[PDB]
Scaffold this active site. Structure first.
Site, PDB file in Angstrom:
ATOM      1  N   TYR A  57       0.856  -1.180   0.000  1.00  0.00           N
ATOM      2  CA  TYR A  57       0.000   0.000   0.000  1.00  0.00           C
ATOM      3  C   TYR A  57       0.887   1.222   0.000  1.00  0.00           C
ATOM      4  O   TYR A  57       1.525   1.521   1.008  1.00  0.00           O
ATOM      5  CB  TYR A  57      -0.906  -0.038   1.240  1.00  0.00           C
ATOM      6  CG  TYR A  57      -2.013   0.996   1.328  1.00  0.00           C
ATOM      7  CD1 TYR A  57      -3.235   0.760   0.733  1.00  0.00           C
ATOM      8  CD2 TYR A  57      -1.854   2.170   2.066  1.00  0.00           C
ATOM      9  CE1 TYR A  57      -4.253   1.665   0.821  1.00  0.00           C
ATOM     10  CE2 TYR A  57      -2.889   3.096   2.172  1.00  0.00           C
ATOM     11  CZ  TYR A  57      -4.085   2.822   1.542  1.00  0.00           C
ATOM     12  OH  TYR A  57      -5.133   3.692   1.589  1.00  0.00           O
ATOM     13  N   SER A 178     -20.329  -5.355   2.377  1.00  0.00           N
ATOM     14  CA  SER A 178     -19.193  -4.638   2.966  1.00  0.00           C
ATOM     15  C   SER A 178     -19.650  -3.375   3.695  1.00  0.00           C
ATOM     16  O   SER A 178     -20.737  -2.870   3.445  1.00  0.00           O
ATOM     17  CB  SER A 178     -18.184  -4.255   1.882  1.00  0.00           C
ATOM     18  OG  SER A 178     -18.727  -3.222   1.089  1.00  0.00           O
ATOM     19  N   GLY A 276     -10.069  -5.027  -4.176  1.00  0.00           N
ATOM     20  CA  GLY A 276      -9.968  -6.323  -4.833  1.00  0.00           C
ATOM     21  C   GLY A 276     -10.015  -7.446  -3.818  1.00  0.00           C
ATOM     22  O   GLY A 276      -9.033  -8.165  -3.630  1.00  0.00           O
ATOM     23  N   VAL A 301      -9.678   7.032  -2.017  1.00  0.00           N
ATOM     24  CA  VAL A 301     -10.127   8.191  -1.262  1.00  0.00           C
ATOM     25  C   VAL A 301      -8.918   8.950  -0.738  1.00  0.00           C
ATOM     26  O   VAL A 301      -8.925  10.168  -0.673  1.00  0.00           O
ATOM     27  CB  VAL A 301     -11.067   7.781  -0.089  1.00  0.00           C
ATOM     28  CG1 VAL A 301     -10.293   7.000   1.000  1.00  0.00           C
ATOM     29  CG2 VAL A 301     -11.752   9.007   0.486  1.00  0.00           C
TER      30      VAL A 301
HETATM   31  N1  LIG Z   1     -10.155   2.725  -2.747  1.00  0.00           N
HETATM   32  C1  LIG Z   1     -10.526   3.303  -1.503  1.00  0.00           C
HETATM   33  O1  LIG Z   1     -10.356   4.499  -1.277  1.00  0.00           O
HETATM   34  C2  LIG Z   1     -11.176   2.447  -0.460  1.00  0.00           C
HETATM   35  C3  LIG Z   1     -11.615   3.022   0.752  1.00  0.00           C
HETATM   36  C4  LIG Z   1     -12.249   2.191   1.721  1.00  0.00           C
HETATM   37  C5  LIG Z   1     -12.406   0.815   1.484  1.00  0.00           C
HETATM   38  N2  LIG Z   1     -11.935   0.236   0.262  1.00  0.00           N
HETATM   39  C6  LIG Z   1     -12.099  -1.129  -0.037  1.00  0.00           C
HETATM   40  O2  LIG Z   1     -13.513  -1.471   0.088  1.00  0.00           O
HETATM   41  C7  LIG Z   1     -13.541  -2.910   0.258  1.00  0.00           C
HETATM   42  C8  LIG Z   1     -14.410  -3.223   1.433  1.00  0.00           C
HETATM   43  O3  LIG Z   1     -13.895  -2.453   2.504  1.00  0.00           O
HETATM   44  P1  LIG Z   1     -14.687  -2.591   3.931  1.00  0.00           P
HETATM   45  O4  LIG Z   1     -13.985  -1.721   4.884  1.00  0.00           O
HETATM   46  O5  LIG Z   1     -16.076  -2.076   3.742  1.00  0.00           O
HETATM   47  O6  LIG Z   1     -14.563  -4.131   4.337  1.00  0.00           O
HETATM   48  P2  LIG Z   1     -15.583  -5.142   5.051  1.00  0.00           P
HETATM   49  O7  LIG Z   1     -16.607  -4.433   5.835  1.00  0.00           O
HETATM   50  O8  LIG Z   1     -14.758  -6.052   5.852  1.00  0.00           O
HETATM   51  O9  LIG Z   1     -16.281  -5.989   3.882  1.00  0.00           O
HETATM   52  C9  LIG Z   1     -15.491  -6.975   3.192  1.00  0.00           C
HETATM   53  C10 LIG Z   1     -16.312  -7.384   1.976  1.00  0.00           C
HETATM   54  O10 LIG Z   1     -15.528  -8.242   1.065  1.00  0.00           O
HETATM   55  C11 LIG Z   1     -16.424  -9.407   0.787  1.00  0.00           C
HETATM   56  N3  LIG Z   1     -15.554 -10.445   0.403  1.00  0.00           N
HETATM   57  C12 LIG Z   1     -14.592 -10.844   1.173  1.00  0.00           C
HETATM   58  N4  LIG Z   1     -13.883 -11.805   0.484  1.00  0.00           N
HETATM   59  C13 LIG Z   1     -14.537 -11.928  -0.816  1.00  0.00           C
HETATM   60  C14 LIG Z   1     -14.371 -12.695  -1.996  1.00  0.00           C
HETATM   61  N5  LIG Z   1     -13.325 -13.635  -2.057  1.00  0.00           N
HETATM   62  N6  LIG Z   1     -15.214 -12.515  -3.028  1.00  0.00           N
HETATM   63  C15 LIG Z   1     -16.196 -11.630  -2.976  1.00  0.00           C
HETATM   64  N7  LIG Z   1     -16.421 -10.877  -1.901  1.00  0.00           N
HETATM   65  C16 LIG Z   1     -15.630 -10.996  -0.819  1.00  0.00           C
HETATM   66  C17 LIG Z   1     -17.195  -9.590   1.995  1.00  0.00           C
HETATM   67  O11 LIG Z   1     -18.434 -10.228   1.637  1.00  0.00           O
HETATM   68  P3  LIG Z   1     -19.063 -11.415   2.500  1.00  0.00           P
HETATM   69  O12 LIG Z   1     -20.020 -10.959   3.527  1.00  0.00           O
HETATM   70  O13 LIG Z   1     -19.849 -12.350   1.663  1.00  0.00           O
HETATM   71  O14 LIG Z   1     -18.037 -12.220   3.206  1.00  0.00           O
HETATM   72  C18 LIG Z   1     -17.479  -8.154   2.368  1.00  0.00           C
HETATM   73  O15 LIG Z   1     -18.549  -7.664   1.556  1.00  0.00           O
HETATM   74  C19 LIG Z   1     -12.139  -3.334   0.493  1.00  0.00           C
HETATM   75  O16 LIG Z   1     -11.646  -3.901  -0.746  1.00  0.00           O
HETATM   76  C20 LIG Z   1     -11.426  -2.103   0.837  1.00  0.00           C
HETATM   77  O17 LIG Z   1     -10.021  -2.228   0.569  1.00  0.00           O
HETATM   78  C21 LIG Z   1     -11.334   1.068  -0.703  1.00  0.00           C
END
Ligand SMILES: NC(=O)c1ccc[n+]([C@@H]2O[C@H](COP(=O)([O-])OP(=O)(O)OC[C@H]3O[C@@H](n4cnc5c(N)ncnc54)[C@H](OP(=O)(O)O)[C@@H]3O)[C@@H](O)[C@H]2O)c1
Ligand SMILES: C/C=C/C(=O)SCCNC(=O)CCNC(=O)[C@@H](O)C(C)(C)COP(=O)(O)OP(=O)(O)OC[C@H]1O[C@@H](n2cnc3c(N)ncnc32)[C@H](O)[C@@H]1OP(=O)(O)O
Ligand SMILES: C/C=C/C(=O)SCCNC(=O)CCNC(=O)[C@@H](O)C(C)(C)COP(=O)(O)OP(=O)(O)OC[C@H]1O[C@@H](n2cnc3c(N)ncnc32)[C@H](O)[C@@H]1OP(=O)(O)O
Ligand SMILES: NC(=O)c1ccc[n+]([C@@H]2O[C@H](COP(=O)([O-])OP(=O)(O)OC[C@H]3O[C@@H](n4cnc5c(N)ncnc54)[C@H](OP(=O)(O)O)[C@@H]3O)[C@@H](O)[C@H]2O)c1
Lengths: 364, 364
Positions: A57, A178, A276, A301
């Site tokens: 990261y 998520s 991802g 973000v």
């Molecule tokens: N680019 C940015 O600025 C930014 C900012 C914040 C967050 N994010 C990203 O947003 C994503 C979720 O973040 P979060 O904080 O909201 O996490 P979270 O609450 O822990 O949610 C994780 C999610 O991933 C799903 N998942 C886990 N393994 C998977 C797989 N192999 N195939 C499909 N789905 C899968 C889970 O679904 P299940 O319930 O079915 O297990 C759940 O929906 C992450 O990738 C995070 O890095 C990006």
């Protein structure tokens, strides 16, 4: 003289391997005029926090000897909620009791206390202040500890890139369960955007579907329906009936899921890839690009708000306002309290290992 | 009365299986005031022509019985160079002897003749006309026959989407040996863009490398080198040492190749997918979108120019001008001449079967 604990690493790696806890001291009797001491109330475990420790990261704190280590060490965690304990002689914008989040990333929120300048922090109203201010609700700890990443991410992805016609147009998102996805569903509801949430199937599917629709998903489908040529016309009809178009896809899964939601957009669609979770690359049929003029872009973000305090502030202010008005609820966290009987880094290691269970919050 | 020949099919499928030749009569004496008769000078076999015959291409000529067949039949081929044989009484945009290309796709160019209206055609200067206009060169048949797709595509991808700084910035492209690739390399040289061409390895690699560098590729690498993590820093050095950035990736292969060239772009890079010769999808690591702000999009010359006559004209004129000035040379074609002894469809079936040998042009 305060004895604090911080979760550190001296080398990147899996959190289970490289994290340790470092005791350190803050002298509350020696505050510079613009300095502030804060005590942590709670800070979450986010995928980015983990990626940061892993070293994959490219936004990270410097490794320093500042916590009293001999090897340069980095702190962990990028968001969290703190309470102001003491302020220097020249601080007028914060006082003891105030709630704050870090003003910038890489502050290190997996720890018990912090010394900083007043401009290292952004003030949130504490629940007492919300109530005094005539608001129907005050923020919870989890709401404040998680306000700065995921809710902003959902808001900005939905509003900053393509204009969805209220009451008509659609976004489609995977990772529907998520934390980001639940914020996205709610914000879609509040801004009157139609949406399809794609989720992994589960035994209590019906329950989860019901919950996400209440948050504000218009339709909820499984990844198997996402994969389904047979199901496709069902989705087209939903959109046709609305009089709108599916203009935006949000992807935090990758692999087949990203393919599936891209396929469901109307021509000239935009996908934002922001995570991802499958570890699979974003996979798009050539024909979507050539014939449907699909565009695939990214969202970060941290980078977007790196030099845009104005946009951060107005977004953050909107989320705060929605919470105070009771229009938004939090992605709930599983909370683990630090009481000193088990080393702080082990709580976070546990939070990492248990992140599959759902968002983890370490509280204090 | 003119007896012409058309390559047709009544059913979609592989050209080798479904093609036949149909004789048909054109009346050169009873032309409507806007009608035009043309004689084909040459027409190439392009991937899209094959895809149409195969029925896997979203834009195709209507099946008709207008060629005098029982079952409805479609013509083949989308581009070619024609000579005007006779025009109607109200036609003043074209004269006998003029050179033209179709003004729109799906015209059916795999045939000896066609009757259409004057607005079905776009005039190019014939060599007489270029000479009289003081140009040092006139177009060749292959240059005219292939001007309307591949060089416009190369030009527009290079200039319409991101501004490369002359003398500094880079594009990277796969399918480096393709006709489009060879135009892009030359157009890059003419506009002073640096470039990397990625090609498949082959017995005569050294010769192919020399040939593409002569055309204008700054560097040529194999797909193996494209894939190589160890070689990666060498490519980054080429770009860094030039003082420019790699801002644009051109993808007509898909699969691992698309991944590899995407990885070579600087932050805020753009990939244009204009083909999928590998039949694998466009595969992009999540990290490129999030951390490198990579964008992936499509290019379809037909759609872009479909309602942009001015842009089409401007581009076509520049390609013509460069040929006339001897600054641009054609991607060479393997030419098969139709003398009327072997059925026309057999020439095109052979062209299709041999398209792996290089661009095929049937001439008349
Ligand atoms: N680019 C940015 O600025 C930014 C900012 C914040 C967050 N994010 C990203 O947003 C994503 C979720 O973040 P979060 O904080 O909201 O996490 P979270 O609450 O822990 O949610 C994780 C999610 O991933 C799903 N998942 C886990 N393994 C998977 C797989 N192999 N195939 C499909 N789905 C899968 C889970 O679904 P299940 O319930 O079915 O297990 C759940 O929906 C992450 O990738 C995070 O890095 C990006
Ligand atoms: C099935 C998907 C087709 C598409 O991707 S259509 C979009 C633009 N078309 C292309 O990029 C052509 C891809 N290549 C072919 O179709 C193909 O190899 C082709 C157009 C050389 C034709 O190849 P052949 O069928 O004659 O034989 P092979 O090259 O597969 O050996
Ligand atoms: C402010 C917060 C920002 C973010 O959350 S962006 C980090 C994205 N991380 C994830 O989605 C966690 C799951 N995926 C991965 O860890 C993943 O390796 C990853 C998303 C890293 C990297 O995945 P890639 O597809 O880019 O694969 P590699 O290039 O690392 O090979
Ligand atoms: N979107 C548009 O508007 C537009 C316009 C024009 C062309 N195109 C597309 O551009 C591409 C090239 O067209 P062209 O007219 O220039 O054809 P071409 O001259 O025949 O070139 C074919 C190219 O594909 C390569 N190739 C063939 N099979 C491959 C494989 N399995 N893996 C990797 N590379 C492979 C060839 O490399 P080798 O030399 O090693 O065989 C060659 O570089 C086609 O995909 C075509 O459909 C699109």
């Amino acid at each position: 003289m305060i004895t604090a604990q911080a979760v550190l690493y001296t080398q990147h790696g899996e959190p289970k391997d490289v994290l340790f806890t470092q005791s350190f001291e803050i002298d509350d009797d020696n505050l510079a005029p613009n300095e502030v001491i804060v005590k942590t109330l709670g800070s979450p475990v986010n995928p980015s926090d983990i990626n940061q420790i892993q070293g994959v990261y490219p936004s990270k704190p410097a490794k320093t000897t500042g916590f009293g280590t001999t090897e340069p060490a980095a702190p962990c965690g990028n968001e969290g909620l703190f309470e102001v304990i003491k302020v220097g002689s020249n601080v007028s914008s914060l006082e003891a009791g105030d709630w704050v989040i870090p003003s910038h990333v890489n502050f290190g929120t997996w720890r018990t206390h912090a010394l900083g300048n007043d401009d290292d922090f952004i003030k949130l109203p504490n629940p007492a202040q919300s109530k005094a201010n005539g608001k129907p609700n005050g923020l919870t700890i989890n709401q404040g500890a998680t306000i700065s990443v995921n809710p902003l991410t959902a808001y900005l992805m939905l509003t900053h890139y393509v204009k969805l016609t209220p009451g008509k147009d659609w976004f489609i998102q995977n990772g529907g369960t998520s934390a980001v996805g639940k914020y996205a569903s709610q914000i879609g509801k509040l801004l009157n955007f139609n949406s399809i949430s794609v989720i992994r199937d589960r035994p209590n599917l019906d329950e989860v579907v019901a919950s996400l629709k209440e948050l504000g998903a218009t339709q909820v489908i499984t990844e198997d329906q996402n994969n389904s040529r047979e199901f496709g016309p069902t989705i087209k009809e939903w959109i046709k009936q609305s009089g709108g178009e599916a203009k935006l896809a949000l992807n935090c899964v990758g692999g087949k899921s990203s393919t599936g939601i891209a396929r469901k957009l109307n021509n000239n669609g935009l996908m934002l890839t922001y995570g991802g979770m499958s570890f699979q690359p974003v996979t798009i049929p050539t024909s979507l690009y050539i014939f449907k003029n699909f565009t695939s872009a990214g969202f970060w973000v941290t980078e977007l708000l790196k030099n845009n305090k104005e946009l951060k502030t107005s977004t953050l202010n909107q989320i705060i306002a929605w919470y105070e008005e009771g229009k938004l609820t939090d992605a709930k966290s599983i909370e683990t309290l630090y009481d000193g009987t088990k080393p702080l880094h082990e709580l976070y290691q546990d939070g990492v290992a248990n992140s599959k269970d759902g968002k983890q919050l370490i509280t204090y």
